[PDB]
Design a protein around this ligand. Structure first.
Ligand SMILES: [Fe+3]
Ligand SMILES: [Fe+3]
Length: 310
C-alpha cells in the first residue's frame, strides 16, 4: 500500500479502535458495532451486528469498558439479520442495557417467523470452530420502542434524534447526533463501494420510501461524519454529500434497469451483472446466493416503482 509511507488525510476510518474522542469501532469494519462514551460510568452501543462476531465485539468492548454493567443503551437501525444478530448473545452480559429500536423493529423480534430468518442467515456465517454463546430469548430482550422525531438523551453530551428512514426495509431508522453532525445511517444510503467511492443502492422494500428518506436526510445540517451499517466512518465531502449521492445512484440504477428492459433484456440479466459487480464486498457476511437474490428483489421493486421512460 502507498499509505505505508505518507501521513495523508484519510476520508474513511476503517480500522477498529478509537474514531473520535467519544467513539470507538468494535469488532469487524465489515459489520461494525460502535461504542459511545456517554459519561465516566456510562456507554451506549450503536448497530447490532452479526451473531458470529460476538466474541470479537465482546473483546473490543472489554478493551474500553472495565465494567459492562455501565452499558446503558443499544441503538438499532433495523431488523435485518446483520443489524440485530448480537442482541440475544451479548444482552445477557450487559445487565443494564436497554435496546432502542423502532416499533416495527421491536415487532419483528416478537415474530417467530422473522426471528428464524435472522437465525438461519446468522448460522451460515459461523466460522470454522466457532460456537455461539448462550442466548437470550428474542422476545425477552430489554427493548424500548422509539419513534420518528424522538430525541434520545443518552447522556448530557449525547442527544440523538431518531429519524424514520424506510425503503431499505419497512422499519429502518437512522440516528442523528446534532452536536457532532454525525449520522448513523444504517443501510439507508446503500452499500458504500470501497473501490469507487459511490453508493450502491439497497432498496429491498420500497423505492418511493427510500428516495423520500434520502430527500429528507439531505436537509439535515451539513454532515461532518457519516456512519453507515458497513465499512466504517466517512468524512469530508463523502459525508456531506452522502444522502444526495445515494439518491442519484438509485436513479441511475433505475435508468439502467429501464433502459435494458427497453432492449428486451430480462431482469435476471441485470441481476447477475449486479451480483458479479457488487457481490464481492459482502461475501464474508452475506451468502452469495442471497446477494443475487437481494439484487433480483431490488430490481423487481424498481421495475414496478420507477417512472416509465415513455
Ligand atoms: Fe439491511
Ligand atoms: Fe446491512
Amino acid at each position: 500500500s502507498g499509505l505505508v509511507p505518507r501521513g495523508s488525510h484519510m476520508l474513511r476510518l476503517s480500522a477498529p479502535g478509537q474514531l473520535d474522542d467519544d467513539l470507538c469501532l468494535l469488532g469487524d469494519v465489515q459489520v461494525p458495532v460502535f461504542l459511545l462514551r456517554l459519561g465516566e460510568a456510562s456507554w451506549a452501543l450503536v448497530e447490532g451486528g452479526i451473531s458470529r462476531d460476538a466474541e470479537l465485539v465482546w473483546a473490543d468492548l472489554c478493551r474500553w469498558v472495565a465494567d459492562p454493567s455501565q452499558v446503558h443503551y443499544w441503538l438499532i437501525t433495523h431488523k435485518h439479520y446483520d443489524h440485530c444478530g448480537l442482541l440475544p448473545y451479548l444482552c445477557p452480559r450487559l445487565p443494564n442495557v436497554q435496546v432502542l429500536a423502532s416499533e416495527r423493529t421491536c415487532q419483528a423480534w416478537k415474530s417467530e417467523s422473522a426471528v428464524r430468518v435472522v437465525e438461519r442467515l446468522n448460522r451460515q456465517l459461523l466460522r470454522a470452530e466457532q460456537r455461539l454463546p448462550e442466548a437470550c430469548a428474542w422476545d425477552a430482550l430489554p427493548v424500548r420502542a422509539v419513534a420518528d422525531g424522538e430525541w434520545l438523551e443518552l447522556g448530557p453530551r449525547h442527544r440523538l434524534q431518531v429519524i424514520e428512514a424506510h425503503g431499505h426495509s419497512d422499519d429502518h431508522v437512522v440516528f442523528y447526533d446534532v452536536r457532532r453532525r454525525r449520522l448513523f445511517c444504517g443501510d439507508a444510503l446503500g452499500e458504500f463501494d470501497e473501490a469507487e467511492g459511490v453508493w450502491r443502492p439497497l432498496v429491498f422494500d420500497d423505492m418511493e420510501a427510500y428516495l423520500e428518506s434520502l430527500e429528507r436526510l439531505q436537509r439535515l445540517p451539513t454532515l461532518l461524519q457519516l456512519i453507515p451499517g458497513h465499512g466504517g466512518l466517512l468524512r469530508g465531502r463523502l459525508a456531506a454529500d452522502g444522502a444526495e449521492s445515494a439518491y442519484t445512484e438509485c436513479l441511475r440504477l433505475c435508468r439502467r434497469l429501464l433502459w435494458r428492459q427497453s432492449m428486451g433484456e430480462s431482469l435476471d440479466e441485470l441481476s447477475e451483472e449486479l451480483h458479479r459487480a457488487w457481490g464481492g464486498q459482502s461475501v464474508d457476511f452475506l451468502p452469495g446466493e442471497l446477494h443475487l437474490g437481494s439484487m433480483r428483489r431490488m430490481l423487481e421493486i424498481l421495475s414496478r416503482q420507477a417512472l416509465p421512460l415513455d
